[PDB]
Enzyme design. Structure first.
Site, mmCIF file in Angstrom:
data_model
loop_
_atom_site.group_PDB
_atom_site.id
_atom_site.type_symbol
_atom_site.label_atom_id
_atom_site.label_comp_id
_atom_site.label_asym_id
_atom_site.label_seq_id
_atom_site.Cartn_x
_atom_site.Cartn_y
_atom_site.Cartn_z
ATOM 1 N N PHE A 88 -3.435 -1.080 -15.191
ATOM 2 C CA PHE A 88 -2.882 -2.398 -14.900
ATOM 3 C C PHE A 88 -1.714 -2.319 -13.916
ATOM 4 O O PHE A 88 -0.792 -1.518 -14.092
ATOM 5 C CB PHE A 88 -2.437 -3.083 -16.198
ATOM 6 C CG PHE A 88 -1.811 -4.440 -15.996
ATOM 7 C CD1 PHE A 88 -2.605 -5.561 -15.784
ATOM 8 C CD2 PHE A 88 -0.434 -4.596 -16.031
ATOM 9 C CE1 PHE A 88 -2.035 -6.812 -15.603
ATOM 10 C CE2 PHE A 88 0.141 -5.840 -15.849
ATOM 11 C CZ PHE A 88 -0.661 -6.952 -15.635
ATOM 12 N N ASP A 147 -12.388 -3.428 3.151
ATOM 13 C CA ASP A 147 -11.733 -4.620 2.595
ATOM 14 C C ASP A 147 -10.285 -4.308 2.318
ATOM 15 O O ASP A 147 -9.882 -4.124 1.170
ATOM 16 C CB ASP A 147 -12.385 -5.134 1.314
ATOM 17 C CG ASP A 147 -12.450 -6.650 1.277
ATOM 18 O OD1 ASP A 147 -11.940 -7.279 2.233
ATOM 19 O OD2 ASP A 147 -13.000 -7.213 0.303
ATOM 20 N N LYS A 185 -7.539 -6.162 2.594
ATOM 21 C CA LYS A 185 -6.756 -7.397 2.562
ATOM 22 C C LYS A 185 -5.570 -7.274 1.602
ATOM 23 O O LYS A 185 -5.645 -6.537 0.615
ATOM 24 C CB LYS A 185 -7.625 -8.577 2.138
ATOM 25 C CG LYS A 185 -8.610 -8.237 1.040
ATOM 26 C CD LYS A 185 -9.345 -9.474 0.573
ATOM 27 C CE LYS A 185 -9.825 -10.285 1.758
ATOM 28 N NZ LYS A 185 -10.849 -11.292 1.362
#
Lengths: 288, 134
Positions: free
Chosen positions: A74, A119, A121
């Site tokens: 997490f 990806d 981003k």
């Protein structure tokens, strides 16, 4: 199992809950087939062989007949919700430089292990409370070690899509990932996205406007690309005082090489670590 | 290494399998490398001599295409050969078999180029290794 605490987000990939604290990701199965998505397969198969401090760690995989849960470490929030929260106060240069440094290390680890992220981003970069930033969401990621494979041009949100893909050229690798970070690099400084296009042709025009319209002296094979047309308006190049003001000239330097038109002369990841932009690099803690 | 590598090759003595390759002219789903990956999957999944069925071959090949080939539609042509001509409603079951093979190999579906070369080196003049793509 253990207990879900809150729902972080929900997209096409599936649904991520917060549930020791872990990120519990349920993967959404296919409609027709009841089977695991190709993206989910790639993400797990890749993350099962990628162990790095700057890459999100896959902790467990729960497979059942109608469900599929992915247990990740997490991290408290992504980079973009962080950039939005710093949009006025600013993002301190030592933290920018620290983040970009870590991002390049994780990326160099991937490229040396023959893996494309495809990806990069802001929303797919997770940060914690001790100054660390990690790569996540390897759903569009793939290995490029095996020769003559089929690749696609659905890869990354236009804003961080390299021009080599927009101009529809086939056979692209790693260079495109560096382009994405280049965009994020700029977006960390100016606090706003560098090439915010609404379509593929528009995305190209935003890039041309900022970095100048490409020549064959800047990009040797640019005019024999499938989606090139001579109609393209020729713009002069603006430079990075007027584009990204708070950057010093070792900063603008690294950025210019990350946003180099020619993929073959575009800067690499391992090399970018050795740029004179990282002598004063530390690991500051951020404000969440 | 293994000596008993034809545990894999007697699949390529089968009638329908040899025709399946013949359908795939330019190796878009049964590339020389994909045929190497399917063997890698076989030994990672610790397959016994019993388990070398063609249905297991096809779910293995489909997995290889899933991992390494971006064009998703091409690998669908495996469904008829593996299921019959009622494959249009049988392929969800096929895909589910793939999910357990992927499970059985502990989700380690990535195969390096060099590891493909290793299995291609045991008997490199077999005709399935001259399925180059140009």
């Amino acid at each position: 199992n253990f207990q879900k605490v809150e729902k972080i987000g929900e997209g096409t990939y599936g649904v991520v809950y917060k549930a020791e604290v872990v990120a519990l990701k349920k993967i959404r199965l296919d409609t027709e087939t009841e089977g695991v998505p190709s993206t989910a397969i790639r993400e797990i198969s890749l993350l099962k062989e990628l162990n790095h401090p700057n890459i999100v760690k896959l902790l467990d995989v729960i497979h059942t007949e109608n469900k599929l849960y992915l247990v990740f470490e997490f991290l408290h929030q992504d980079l973009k919700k962080f950039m939005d929260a710093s949009a006025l106060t600013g993002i301190p240069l030592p933290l920018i430089k620290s983040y970009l440094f870590q991002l390049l290390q994780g990326l160099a680890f991937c490229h040396s292990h023959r893996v494309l992220h495809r990806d990069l981003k802001p929303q797919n970069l997770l940060i914690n409370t001790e100054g660390a930033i990690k790569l996540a969401d390897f759903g569009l990621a793939r290995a490029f070690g095996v020769p003559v494979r089929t690749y696609t041009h659905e890869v990354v949100t236009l804003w961080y899509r390299a021009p080599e893909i927009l101009l529809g050229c086939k056979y692209y690798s790693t260079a495109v990932d560096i382009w994405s970070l280049g965009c994020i690099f700029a977006e960390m400084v100016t606090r706003r996205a560098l090439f915010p296009g609404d379509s593929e042709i528009d995305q190209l025009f935003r890039i041309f406007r900022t970095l100048g319209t490409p020549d064959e002296v800047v990009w040797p094979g640019v005019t024999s690309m499938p989606d090139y047309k001579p109609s393209f308006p020729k713009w002069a190049r603006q430079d990075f005082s007027k584009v990204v003001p708070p950057l010093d000239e070792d900063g603008r330097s690294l950025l210019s090489q990350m946003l180099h038109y020619d993929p073959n002369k575009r800067i690499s990841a391992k090399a970018a670590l050795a740029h004179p932009f990282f002598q004063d690099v530390t690991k500051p803690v951020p404000h969440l | 290494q293994r000596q008993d590598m034809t545990a894999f090759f007697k699949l390529f003595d089968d009638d329908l399998i040899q025709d399946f390759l013949w359908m795939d002219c330019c190796c878009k789903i049964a590339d020389k490398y994909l045929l190497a990956m399917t063997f890698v999957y076989f030994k990672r999944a610790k397959f016994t001599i019993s388990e070398h069925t063609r249905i297991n071959f096809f779910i293995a090949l489909y997995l290889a295409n899933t991992v390494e080939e971006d064009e998703e539609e091409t690998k669908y042509e495996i469904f008829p050969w593996a299921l019959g001509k009622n494959w249009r409603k049988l392929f969800p079951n096929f895909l589910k078999l793939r999910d357990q093979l992927w499970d059985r190999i502990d989700y380690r579906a990535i195969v390096s180029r060099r590891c493909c070369e290793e299995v291609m080196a045991i008997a490199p003049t077999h005709y399935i290794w001259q399925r180059e793509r140009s």
